């Protein structure tokens, strides 16, 4: 695959890690968000599925101060809140 158009706050996140376009696949969106979390070291060092997004644009995007990478449906749901799906 689907093409998506990130809303502005997600766009700013994507761009802070090198993405320069306005339309993405979900795969690109997940890759860049992954890069954002890794590069900013937002994950718990001991339990690396835990991500802290408070005090960060990611927390404003997601609306939660923390989440677990294992929470697949919650992650996608949060991402979709911040995307318009093409078509």
């Amino acid at each position: 695959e689907t093409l998506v158009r990130p809303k502005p706050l997600l766009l700013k996140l994507l761009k802070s890690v090198g993405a320069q376009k306005d339309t993405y696949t979900m795969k690109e969106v997940l890759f860049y968000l992954g890069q954002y979390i890794m590069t900013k070291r937002l994950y718990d060092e001991k339990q690396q599925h835990i991500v802290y997004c408070s005090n960060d644009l990611l927390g404003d995007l997601f609306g939660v101060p923390s989440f677990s990478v294992k929470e697949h449906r919650k992650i996608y749901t949060m991402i979709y809140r911040n995307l318009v799906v093409v078509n």
Partner: peptide, 11 residues
């Protein structure tokens, strides 16, 4: 289990 390993299961 590394962050990278976890992130991959999302795909």
């Amino acid at each position: 289990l590394t962050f990278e390993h976890y992130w991959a299961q999302l795909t």
